[PDB]
Amino acid sequence: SDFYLPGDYLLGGLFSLHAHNFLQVPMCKEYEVKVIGYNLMQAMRFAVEEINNDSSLLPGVLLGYEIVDVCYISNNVQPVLYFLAHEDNLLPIQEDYSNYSSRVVAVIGPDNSESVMTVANFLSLFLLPQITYSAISDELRDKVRFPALLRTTPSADHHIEAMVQLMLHFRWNWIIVLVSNDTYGRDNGQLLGERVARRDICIAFQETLPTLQPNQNMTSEERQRLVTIVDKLQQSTARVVVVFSPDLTLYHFFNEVLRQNFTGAVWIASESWAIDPVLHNLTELRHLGTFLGITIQSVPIPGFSEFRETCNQECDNCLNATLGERVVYSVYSAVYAVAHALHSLLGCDKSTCTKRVVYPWQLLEEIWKVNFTLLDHQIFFDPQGDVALHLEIVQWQWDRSQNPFQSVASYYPLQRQLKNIQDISWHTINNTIPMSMCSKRCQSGQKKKPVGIHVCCFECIDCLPGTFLNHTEDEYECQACPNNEWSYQSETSCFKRQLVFLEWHEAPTIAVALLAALGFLSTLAILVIFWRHFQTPIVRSAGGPMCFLMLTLLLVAYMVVPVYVGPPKVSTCLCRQALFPLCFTICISCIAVRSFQIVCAFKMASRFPRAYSYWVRYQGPYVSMAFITVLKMVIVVIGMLATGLSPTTRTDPDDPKITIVSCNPNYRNSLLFNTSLDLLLSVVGFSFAYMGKELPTNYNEAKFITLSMTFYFTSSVSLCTFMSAYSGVLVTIVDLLVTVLNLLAISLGYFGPKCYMILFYPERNTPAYFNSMI
Template sequence: MGLWARMLCSLLFLLQVLAEPAENSNFHLAGDYLLGGLFSLHANVKGTVHLNILQVPKCKEYDMKVLGYNLMQAMRFAVEEINAHSSLLPGVLLGYEIVDICYLSNNVQPVLYFLAQKDYSLPILKDYSHYVPHVVAVIGPDNSESTITVANFLSLFLLPQITYSAISDQLRDKQRFPAMLRTVPSGSHHIEAMVQLMIHFRWNWIVVLVSNDEYGRDNSQLLNQRLLSGGDICIAFQEVLPTPAPNQIMTPTEQAQLEAILRKLQQTTARVVIVFSPELALRNFFLTVLRWNLTNTVWIASESWSIDPVLHNLTELRHTGTFLGITIQRVPMPGFSEFRVRGTRDSPPPSSGTSQQTTCNQECDACLNITASFNNILTLSGERVVYSVYSAVYAVAHALHSLLGCNQTNCAKKVVYPWRLLQEIWKVNFTLLGNQIFFDEQGDVPVRLDIIQWRWDLSQNPFQSFASYHPMQRELKHIGNVSWHTPDNTIPVSMCSKNCRPGQMKRPVGLHPCCFECLDCMPGTFLNQSADEFDCQPCPSASWSHKNAISCFKRHLAFLEWQEVPTIIVVILAVLGFLSTLTILVIFWRHYQTPMVRSAGGPMCFLMLTPLLLVFGMVPVYVGPPTVFTCICRQAFFTLCFTICISCIAVRSFQIVYIFKMARRLPRAYGFWVRYHGPYVFVALMTAIKAAIIAGNMLTTTINPIGRTDPEDPNILILSCHPNYRNGLLFNTSMDLLLSMVGFSFAYMGKELPTNYNEAKFITLSMTFSFTSSISLCTFMSVHDGVLVTIMDLLVTVLNFLAISLGYFGPKCYMILFCPERNTPAYFNSMIQGYTMRKD
């Protein structure tokens, strides 16, 4: 066929199409493959009241839903647009069968009609794999309750169903509803968008009003679950709105319920009200709100009424507060505004054999006229939910394109089984008016949600978007300015309690965590808001804080330092003691065989001098921050050395008295004492007992250094060895005092001994000083705390050892160095003989 012949045939075909009359109904369109459409053109919000009579309800007797007819027109627009563009389904004509479901009242009969064959029969079969119903797919319904009812039927046949507005999370269960998909995000995303909106504006005290149906109950449950998981927002109260009759006339009981709700709204401090309800159930409510003159309220609309033009037409609502809502993204659809108000011409019934008598609720006399009266606001509001219908039809068309193996010129017309078409719908992924359309694993299209504000300024969009919520990222974006119905356009405050100042913790008041009083955090504590806003946490041991602090600062560590004057004085004394002891040790070593050294104890003198020398050399362990090693030295080394010295003095005093006064009376005991080295055994025994006391004290208390707060200045942290240091000192001192008393007693008993052996006054001096200093230290520690205790402890320790070194060994060194004539055996013998003669 030549080019001119093809052009002639095309022209004849076009003239034939133009000559045919248009369809006579908005509800029918003949085609090769039919789509079923379920829309709510009218609504009986009282529910399924028709079940008490055996007939299909007459939807046109109920109130009309302008948005329902608008959505229906979107389906017609999409089908006609696909048919006009041969690239998607070339040579294939899509048709539709649309039924008004009256919101809830007329669900089952249309589904049975869609599932039946062309002869209106629905056979009972064992296997429906090759069953061909009246339609290849169903678009709708609009609400979740009706969608669940329809999906229970269609899923048995795996007949694809794409809803454009039902958001219930129950529909995400693909085991229960394997054939149900939707072109809107689920209800959990709508709830999350609401919650993030409230968090952004710091609203944590809200009121929830719900309709007495599945829609209200499901969404309020989702909201409560979300708030329980987050804990940032509290519900002041939740009430169920009375459902009006189809004629919108309220009974006295319903009027009383509304007034009780309005009374609570007036009394509560919550200024944000979330309303989950179909739009037809809200007209009486908002008329009552206007009568009560309720103002300064933020109304947050769920998707069911967020862009309802009828409620928006109540212009006096602008005085009640600010209206915000959650809805589908705005997508302009070129040509739809003109198509929406385009009428149809009468024509014969469609060639598909369908007639108005075969179904019901496929007429709406007032739909076109009423929609035309709202056309301006519908146009200005942008195409939102209608795009969900539009994209649902295109999703089926793309699936048919794949299933029929279409190319640029034609498609293979063949029998389409529902389950095969369903498989192809799950795979679709295409771009439509700049948006990517595909179904996730729950069967949802993750399109953007818009946060809109109602505006009554005729020159602007009546439903103006100021933020968006992205289901994939689960976050609010592009938050713009809102025109608040408040003085100076300030953001309304809806909080049970005002925010606490920094450094103040919250103490709950009542049952709601959002209601609290603010208490100051005390010094030494701070408030970590990211961890716990209801409790002030104590600062770590090395840190401190002032009142109302949100963090701690490091305290000044107090310990004995080298540059301090008391430290310098004590170190000078220690150096003096070290040098004097070293001198005494050298003198005694060089005069070891002299009577003076032997009368002082002989080898036992070196047992006393060696610990004294080590003690003076270990004084630096008291200076600087304490460690485990220095604490052990303070608690063990010094007191052991002191015990060794006191034991040696005590046993030496005993030995001198025993020799001069009791040796002759108890010669065997003296021989036994000498033979078994009694002095050294006594010193070892006393040292072992002291070591056991020290070990027991260390086991019952910690050895690690700790910090204690200075009672006079909390900014200072005193570093010490352990908190029971006083108790340990008392235990250690008690044994030393006992040995001192023993040594003093024997020294006193020997006051009549020869001068060279009479050490009573020297021992008395050192022991009295040791006793007095220990008592003074314990008394000082019971009164004072801090670095002074460490200084006093070190000073007493050094002075005690100086008293032993200079008080006991000093006079003997003097005699050795300056009175050598008295350090001879002859002189000692004469002194002993003189003592013996006096005794005789």
Template sequence: MGPQARTLHLLLLLLHVLAKPVQLIENSDFHLAGDYLLGGLFSLHANVKSISHLSYLQVPKCNEFDMKVLGYNLMQAMRFAVEEINNCSTLLPGVLLGYEMVDVCYHSNNVHPGLYFLAQDDEFLPILQDYSHYMPHVVAVIGPDNSESAITVSNLLSHFLIPQVTYSAISDELRDKRRFPAMLRTVPSASHHIEAMVQLMTHFHWNWIVVLVSNDDYGRENGQLLSQRLIRTGDICIAFQEVLPTPEPSQGMGPEEQSQLDNILEKLQRTTARVVVVFSPELALHGFFREVLRWNFTGLVWIASESWSIDPVLHNLTELRHTGTFLGITIQRVSIPGFSEFRVRHTKATQPISNKTSPRATCNQDCDACLNITESYSNVLMLSGERVVYSVYSAVYAVAHALHRLLRCNQVRCTKEVVYPWKLLRELWDVNFTLLGNQLFFDQQGDMPMFLDIIQWQWDLSQNPFQSIAFYSPTKQRMTYIHNVSWHTPNNTIPMSMCSKSCQPGQMKKPVGLHTCCFECVNCLPGTYLNLSADEFNCLPCPDSMWSHMNAITCFKRLQAFLEWHEAPTIVVALLASLGFFSTLAILLIFWRHFQTPMVRSAGGPMCFLMLVPLLLAFGMVPVYVGRPTVFTCFCRQAFFTVCFSVCLSCITVRSFQIVCVFKMARRLPRAYGFWVRYHGPYVFVAFITAVKVALVAANMLATTINPIGRTDPEDPNIVILSCHPNYRNGLLFNTSMDLLLSVVGFSFAYMGKELPTNYNEAKFITLSMTFSFTSSISLCTFMSVHNGVLVTIMDLLVTVLNFLAISLGYFGPKCYMILFYPERNTPAYFNSMIQGYTMRKS
């Protein structure tokens, strides 16, 4: 090449350099040229120092705000990710990613960058009817970091379907894809952060907490989410919830704010709650914690929301270690190789440093002090694992993978074409890739289900200042406990934060006041137990077949009591029943053999068999009283025995009436006597009484039940008495009343016939039977009214057997004695002589 050609070449090269835009050199931290530009929104500054920016129509100046260390750290993460992707030959080969990043100053500068990103390269935003083929300045936007700013920007970008991937905005409001169709995020939503907090408090049995929130959307929304979650749980109560005062810009804490803060700290000092949950941006807490230090609080547990859980500036207040234990919820720790060195990398010495804003700048990007301030926290940031930067890093990679799909890239090249944001958004929803060992994808709400870390603040310079103690899985919604916590308490004991101490096993909680966490412990009485999984505030009664001692948590099976064959009372009654059965069978056979004799006919003739057969069956059915009650045995007890007894009583009653009628009323009322004989009056009377008795028994069974039940023994609650339904006593009262009436009537007629001939005079036998029946029934009713034990069943059976024996032996016994041992008196001649003698004495 000749000298002239060489000179021309150098001149062209110089013109090419001089023609480069000035802002590319001046603002290299904020702008990188490329084939496709990504927009970045970061809070490098926040906590405005004055309100002067409200008096003119210009973007805020950096010197009007405090430096936000983490914001600059996150911006560097986006720069690092873009440069790493550009240096990678496989993800986007032949494609150069660029970026345009803006300092949004937390809340103060949101709309202006959004409009700038929507405009074209000539900063013109046309009003069109169809934006399907519109090319904005950027193809996607990363950020901003807080929910309020993210919602503001998304309201602009979503109308154009420009993908927006936020890395730190956790509001549940952003999950509504009808309002924010282009919004995605690389962090779990606020609901998962709240759930991790609740599970943390549940793990350490803290149920009495204080909630402090900032006076903004972030504090109010998260405070409400926590309150709603605790209401659903019911195990954790809020002692009080207060809004932290926010001083006016450019002013210190005013008298009103100071008084409000003093009232909060005074309440915090008086309360028994030792756990304090704080939802607030980090920059608003500096003044609060300085006041906490001034009040000399100790022994508290501070639970930090994600907004300040890893803030290095607050952590730099080392005196906070004396106030208690600091725990926080933050994103999963993922180490990014090479980033720590990149973060503190100085710009080239040849690059001029200027505080002036370039013509195309969207915010005053004079951040000369950013790197210097960040370097002072370099050790803390490095030891903390650069936690949130992975969310920015993964957001940039998610957009790059979507571009990879949209541009149909392979290992060597991509098809460069016009990328419309709405097409990129469609591909972004479907990305699924692995980045530094984590599988990344977006769920149906547009969230990336990253793990959350529960961290503890440490102040030992040789270790991680934010030590992981547990992690929370959004997909499983479960916290896993990993490490022990070093509590800032004597002997490293877990702080207690409970309105009331835990009750002992078997003690129910009696609420005191409005909070369910404040209660008294009351012992569960015998017969009740406490089922913690069902109800902590009520002792549940044990089932009928079970019992419990005082302060029981379970019931045990009670001993079942009923008549058994091996017991002495049962053996005695069984012997009496056997005596009755065999004696009645013998009487039946004797009467059958001597049926035509005057003695049998004078005793009632055929009606004797109507009495003896039920007696025989009743004695044979006595075993139904022994053993475990069943429906059949209860039916026999309540129906069969009482009907048989009533049949016998009605037969005796009508027999007594018939004897008196024959000897005294036949001659006075001959027509009535003829009517009585003609229509078989005795049998009609017995049938009527039996029908009435059957109706009473049936009505009683229908009104109650014949199913056996268990009743607690009043003398020993550990025993349950198995018997027939106790309501049968009401029916027994009617049944007994009818039997008593028959006994009285039979007794009366027998007494009226006491002067009859000896062979016909059965008054003393009937009187004996009826008197015994009357007194035994009265005794049984009295005993049942004052006693409920197993003896009731024994007494019921004993009285029943004795009543039948009284009829069998008391009424029929003398007849058999006369038939067997005085046959000469069982002749018609002897009976006629007795009647003639009675008639002559009456004449």
């Protein structure tokens, strides 16, 4: 048969041309033929024949081979014993093999990773070099574990990286993973899990497919299993679906997905099914979505298109069963690598070959060493045992003028990135990239709020006033505004707030100041006209030091306006909160005690002469004025110390720009406390004068007390009413206006009539007029 050819040195070859009572071990021929095995076997035979023809590569030396049709898992062991034998069938057992010479010097090994590990563990103790062409399992990189093994292909690492960089390029953030129950699926799914989270992509969910087979009928439980998986596909918002499975099993899965009326996904196919003709020919797949697949890049062998067209080394149906491009170059490069390593081991040059007996471990030591250009591609073994061959991404196309599979990207494993991506004709309405992300991006000024486990899951929430969003600093909590700034809720930046207080530019402010000035000069005129008539009965009965100092206090109190108006200072704030109210209050108290003296004192003297005898003895009225004054002192200080000596800042009720500066931030509270006692004094004096309504003893004093305290009472009640329905800037200026109006109430309503009589009814200055009352 063609499975064997002689030579000076021999290569072993294991290819899966095919696929118990357990004692009845089946022969390899008892299973269906697989065409890819014929392709790979003919690739090896072509490579060895070409190397024998090339007189410059092995001058005067012929390569041979022994090829065995290993059926993909079963009937292992026998080939390695067949290869390792010293002569005929015999293999010696000994401690050290450094001087041993096996039948073959190198093995072109199996395809299935399980079989590769099985064969490698048996070859390892001899260090007979093995090269394999399609086992992508990543565990084979452990050369402590597999010292004899090398590969002509990138490992699963680079396939997963191709997938991940495809996802990054098109910004797919949110994916689904489906795996077979095999070691292949579980391994590749965990590896994808290790690559994805590292780079910010998130897996929505992962689930294992059932191990169905295409020929047999599906059971009810398997049917429901597929239904349950497709339901989770249909419910999820993700649309990138990654499938790690052998090809044969997926026929049922895609039949079910079609039956379920599913559509709109991107399917990313792993190496095991990315190029399957049978799945591609499933007629209705084209409605489901876009199919992309990672696969090793095809390199055309020049001469192969012509060349292709006691047991386990024979076949009866191979060619007629035939009547693999992407793996053929791996097989070809493996054979050429062995040839070059042998050429180096023999120390050879054109027509100088010396035909040593070669021990496999030295051939391994040289196989690690080769570096040459083959078919316009350069192949050398990485210390981890892999040759760098390009990968590609193929989109499936259902136009049969071109090839079924169209390349759309290429992955360079040494530069380790995906390059020159081309047009992918998507399923969307206008070839817009099909998006799939867990969440919408934040609007300006919105914080993130994580949801669930995954990084991609978050709500978007507006920043509150007093905070702002700073992309340079954070996005999961808001940055606080400086103490003199603010923000318009959902905003990227702050804005400066403005202080507000009374100043003379304002019409009402200057108006109030002018009113206070009128009051001041009128009070001073009253004082001086009283002084000019100190000798008169009017000033004797309703004047003297009490009125002199009352007018002095009142005219200095009129100087409040320059202290209210203008930028505040601590001392002026203390002056407003205690001093002006204090010096104003005692005047009202004087009016009160005079209202007592005019009538109620006589009621006391007649009804309660004992109390009156005490009252006149202990200086009743002056003591009463001092007593209420000290009560007022306590009342002012206990509020001020509870609210602070310094000026205070308050927010404007509905204008975000304005901050209002004023004393007494607890206005209403103190307003009530301060007035309560003052207005009670007002009421008691008012009622006393009302009782002695027509008493003319003090030049009809009761009428004018009544008038003045009426003005005071009504103004105070009006202020308390106004404060219940307004909160804006006008508060303090209206406060000042009412203060000035009360100063006017006293200064004019009480003293003015006396001065009017002095000036314009001078006959009333005579003692003759005064005595008419007696």
